Amino acid sequence: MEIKLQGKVSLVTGSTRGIGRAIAEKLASAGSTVIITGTSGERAKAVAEEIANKYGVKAHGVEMNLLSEESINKAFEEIYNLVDGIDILVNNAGITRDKLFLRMSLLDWEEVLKVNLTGTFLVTQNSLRKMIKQRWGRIVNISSVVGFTGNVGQVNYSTTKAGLIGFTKSLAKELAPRNVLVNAVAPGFIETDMTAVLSEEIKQKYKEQIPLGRFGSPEEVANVVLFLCSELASYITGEVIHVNGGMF
Amino acid sequence: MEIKLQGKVSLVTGSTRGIGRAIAEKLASAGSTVIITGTSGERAKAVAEEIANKYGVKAHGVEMNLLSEESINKAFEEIYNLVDGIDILVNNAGITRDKLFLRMSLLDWEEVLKVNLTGTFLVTQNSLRKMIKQRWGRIVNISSVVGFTGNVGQVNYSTTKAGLIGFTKSLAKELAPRNVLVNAVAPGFIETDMTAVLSEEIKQKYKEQIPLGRFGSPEEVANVVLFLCSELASYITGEVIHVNGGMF
Amino acid sequence: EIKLQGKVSLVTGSTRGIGRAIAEKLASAGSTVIITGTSGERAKAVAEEIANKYGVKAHGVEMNLLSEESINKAFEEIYNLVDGIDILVNNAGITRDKLFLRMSLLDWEEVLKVNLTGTFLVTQNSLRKMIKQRWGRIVNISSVVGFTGNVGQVNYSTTKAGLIGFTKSLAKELAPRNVLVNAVAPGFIETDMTAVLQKYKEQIPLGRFGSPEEVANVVLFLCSELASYITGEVIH
Amino acid sequence: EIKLQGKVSLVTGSTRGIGRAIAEKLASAGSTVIITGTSGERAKAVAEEIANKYGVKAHGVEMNLLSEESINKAFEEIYNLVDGIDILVNNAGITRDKLFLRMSLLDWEEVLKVNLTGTFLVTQNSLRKMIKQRWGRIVNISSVVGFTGNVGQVNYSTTKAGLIGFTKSLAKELAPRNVLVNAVAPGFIETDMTAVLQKYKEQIPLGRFGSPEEVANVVLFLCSELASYITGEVIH
């Protein structure tokens, strides 16, 4: 009947805005304690406070810059002083540095790998303790349709979004004996506040790629993450769920 | 918070036992009116009555032999006299006729295609009316991990379970403009009452293919079908969700 | 450097189009070829043309994949002409394009019977020599739309996806006998049928339709020594 | 029938194993070959051996994929030896196998830096001639474990899956210039490293490990005229 996560603690990286924020709010709506992260601790704490006021949940904001190992490990010291541990991890944080391939600087490439892959690696390693101990955990990695299709100007980003699938399937196999389930969600074209910057022409060209004829909302992505964190997904691990309105 | 299907009508083919029955009970548990089908009308009506008593839902049983077009169309005449129409269709019904390839009779092959593919085609065609009219519908096709991996002795069955993926992706594109979402669920190794017939040795050999180290329950499959019928899956169409404990 | 002299290849539906290109490609590598079509006279004429062009042993047989009887008769003839088949290319296929809501049972069932059941029966009849000698290649022609789906093609896409399950399963069964089973999935290919139609082309990064010979070349690769460790695979 | 005379192929990490087999295969088809290894002396020795065996123009260069400086120096040398590169085989790769819960940041970061970032930089440096002439082949060596995942290999599997995104994206960007970008995903292959290990073999329908030459043959196909309509594809 209902999906309840009262008593669970969910960490959602890069959740001060956009899809990450929608994911944190969705988990909060189900009763989860939530941990909000951003490159600004002030903004993360502000967002946590707004979520706590809206849904009445225990919420904590931490500064976490996924470019920095020191920032990540320091964030976890603050986290483990506030909660017993983490039951649910959503590896949402990610960046793009879009350039045509020959025009892509080494820094453009390495930053995208550092955040999207190495950041995910470090955050996941940091989050497993309570999950392994109690033989229950959910890790949800946010991929992208472009990890599957490829995309012009995003060889770096697409490499990471595809790489997260290998990450997901391998980690799922390793953690399966401990009942810690590791899955991916691969959104298509999602409307966020940043969509407002696109021209009506190209925005229409994008919508034309989508059988449903509309962009998805951040909440529609968040709904699938919630499913994966719920008792409805107890036999799903090593899987990617595409959420793209029929594009792929 | 909750998944409610009160006011919806779900048809689940081949739902007098096993996974099909678990799917019908799960939808019933969420408040859906359910239609139960089997090759025996008496058994289908008996199962419907048991489900109605357990969950308190409106339930109807119809005889439907998916080997027969006449049986299917006749079943729908009874259905449309009992309900306004169908909002949710789960194409669960399927058969195997396992033979090594050179040893497979034409009837072994054609029966499997007739039920698994043509039966699905006919049931789906029969069920769309209300969905298209109201611009809301969910069709869930039950595939199998073997549609993806292949399996010795099941060239016929695997052909159909793979074919259902093409069916799903094509139909999803056609119906997307009407907001009728078409998806597949691909179970792995699921424990049913028929599992009791296997030797402990081979049953163990199967479990060894599964990272979670256990067979899934019919209810765990039913849970994923429910997700696809719920408001949590509003941006998912043309997708297959694997439910196999990490096998694939 | 790819030579198939001494091999016998059966290519179904090879009187025209991609099928003809595959048969000519195999012939160009030295294979004996068996051409099939719904018209035995046409199949024989095409075989004669290929034999004249490439200098190979070529035979034409009538084979209508809708009919078990047609298939049986064709194989009786085949096995009176060759010792057996080393290479099978399941190319024969049909479309009956209709929006799902306008699709008849016949629109559906004919496409399955030819594309799946015809393939099944042809394949069953083609394995004897391959299993005995522990060498054989079966190549199933699928389609990109089996993977992506396509509007107006729920029936065809079902069959082309189904052929993937068929390929993977059969590959597993035959692998102990070193009989390799693979699929080729062409995108948009310029054939005789294309002339009766820029748009579809906009979906293609290469910005052009493929030629039948380009598909044929991939079939040739799969029949070659270069593909000795590939089985249960789809080449797009 | 596959000839690469006049073509120049760069094969990274080709002093031994699958890399060496690929370089020898290309050489056997007539390609000029560039051999790389972390040891320039070893790379040069292997190039000399290949040149002696096949009669081709072969060059060995030191290239350590961890170091941008090493890569730059190697390409400076390369472009003083050849007009440019027509074929690139991104073969170089490392494993640092550890259970995830025992994996160090270095176990992780080294594997990404070599397998992904090294591939990135090598590829950027190899495109000039291909784009100019509107012909080129880039073949990325992935692995079955990129698709299935593997216990003890979360780092390696991440890179091998990532190379698929890399392949598909780069293929889309380069397709207008007719530069084709594909991946080969080997299963379990018997190499020099195998001897230090029936089980893994039980997962293989063919019931045997593949040879390095069998992988090399598929790379050769992708570099050939037979693969002219294949781009953004993985061959397993």
Give one word for B17, left, alpha or beta, with left for phi > 0 and alpha for psi -120 to 50. beta
Q: Which residues pair with C8 in a beta bridge?
A: C32
Decide: helix, strand or coil at residue D129. Answer: helix
Please give the sequence-ordered ranges of beta strands (E in DSSP) within D38-190, or none if there are none. 58-62, 87-90, 136-141, 179-184
Dist. CA A145–CA A126, nearest whole Å: 27
Alpha helices in chain C (DSSP H): 17-28, 40-54, 68-79, 105-112, 119-124, 128-133, 145-148, 154-174, 212-222
Residue B232 has its nearest CB partner, among A4, A188, A226, at A226
Which residue does chain A place closest to D110, by CA atoms?
Answer: A118
Residues in chain C: 236
Q: Which residues of B are annotated as a binding site?
A: 14-17, 39, 65-66, 92, 144, 157-161, 190
Dist. CA B116–CA B93, nearest whole Å: 7
Query: With an 8 Å Cβ cutoff, are B162 and C160 in contact?
Result: no
Which residue does chain C place closest to D178, by CA atoms?
Answer: C206
Q: Which among C71, C76, C83 has a CA at the least distance from the CA of C121?
A: C71
Paired tokens of A127? 């989050």
Dist. CA A229–CA A9, nearest whole Å: 11
Q: Which residues pair with B186 in a beta bridge?
A: B242
Please spell the DSSP secondary structure of D41-55, one letter per residue: HHHHHHHHHHHHHH-
Asked if D140 and D163 count as a contact pair (C-beta separation under 8 A), the reply is: yes
Q: Which residues pair with B96 in a beta bridge?
A: none
- Contacting B residues, span 179-208, partner chain A, CB-CB under 8 Å: 179, 188
Q: Under 8 Å CB-to-CB from B22, ≥6 apart: which residues?
A: B217, B218, B219, B221, B222
Query: With an 8 Å Cβ cutoff, are A244 and B221 in contact?
Result: no
Strand order in the sheet with C87-90: C58-62, C32-37, C8-11, C87-90, C136-141, C179-184, C234-235
In Å, how far is C70's CA from the nearest CA of chain B? 15
Angle between helices D154-174 and D105-112 (to 10 degrees): 20
Dist. CA A71–CA A126, nearest whole Å: 12
Query: With an 8 Å Cβ cutoff, are C228 and D236 in contact?
Result: no
As a CATH number, domain C1-236 is 3.40.50.720
Paired tokens of C70? 């047609």
Say if residue A190 carries a ligand binding annotation. Answer: yes
Question: CA-CA-CA-CA torsion for B221, B226, B231, B236, nearest 10 degrees?
Answer: 40
Paired tokens of D184? 């080969």
Asked if D45 and D62 count as a contact pair (C-beta separation under 8 A), the reply is: no
Q: Which among D39, D216, D209, D65 has a CA at the least distance from the CA of D139?
A: D216
Asked if C131 and C177 count as a contact pair (C-beta separation under 8 A), the reply is: yes
In Å, how far is C193's CA from the nearest CA of chain B? 22
Query: With an 8 Å Cβ cutoff, are C231 and D205 in contact?
Result: yes
Asked if D172 and C207 count as a contact pair (C-beta separation under 8 A), the reply is: no
Say if residue A118 carries a ligand binding annotation. Answer: no
Angle between helices B155-175 and C154-174 (to 10 degrees): 150
Say if residue A156 carries a ligand binding annotation. Answer: no
**DSSP single-letter state for residue A118:** I
Does residue D6 belong to the interface with chain C, where contact is any CB pair within 8 Å?
no
Resolution (A): 1.8
For B12-47, give one letter per residue: b (16+ CB within 10 A) or e: bbbbbebbbbbbbbbbbbbbbbbbbbbbebebbbeb
Q: Which residues pair with B34 in a beta bridge?
A: B10, B59
Dist. CA A142–CA A65, nearest whole Å: 17
Positive or negative: CA dihedral D9, D10, D16, D19: negative
Does residue A5 belong to the interface with chain B, where contact is any CB pair within 8 Å?
no
In Å, how far is B132's CA from the nearest CA of chain A? 14
Dist. CA D213–CA D209, nearest whole Å: 12
Method in brief? X-ray
User: Which residues of chain C make contact with D1, given a CB cutoff of 8 A?
Assistant: 1-3, 29
Decide: helix, strand or coil at residue D34. Answer: strand
Give one word for B179, left, alpha or beta, with left for phi > 0 and alpha for psi -120 to 50. left
Cα dist from D155 to A39, A146, A183, C61, D161, whole Å = 26, 21, 17, 55, 10
How would CATH label the architecture of A1-248?
3-Layer(aba) Sandwich (3.40)
**DSSP single-letter state for residue C81:** T
Cα B210–Cα B214–Cα B217 angle in degrees, nearest 5: 115
Query: Backbone breaks in chain D (C–N > 2.5 Å) follow which residues?
Result: 197
Q: Which amino acid is at B67?
A: L
Please spell the DSSP secondary structure of A27-69, one letter per residue: HHHTT-EEEEEES-HHHHHHHHHHHHHHH---EEEEE--TT-H
Positive or negative: CA dihedral D166, D168, D171, D176: negative
Task: State phi, psi for D60 to the nearest 5 degrees.
Answer: -110, 135
Asked if D70 and A145 count as a contact pair (C-beta separation under 8 A), the reply is: no
Asked if C60 and C81 count as a contact pair (C-beta separation under 8 A), the reply is: no
Which residue does chain B place closest to A223, by CA atoms?
Answer: B232
Catalytic (active-site) positions of B: 157
For chain D, the first-to-last Cα distance in angstroms comes to 23
Please count the other Cβ atoms lying within 10 Å of the Cβ belonging to residue B83.
15
Give one word for B56, left, alpha or beta, with left for phi > 0 and alpha for psi -120 to 50. left
Dist. CA A244–CA A224, nearest whole Å: 11
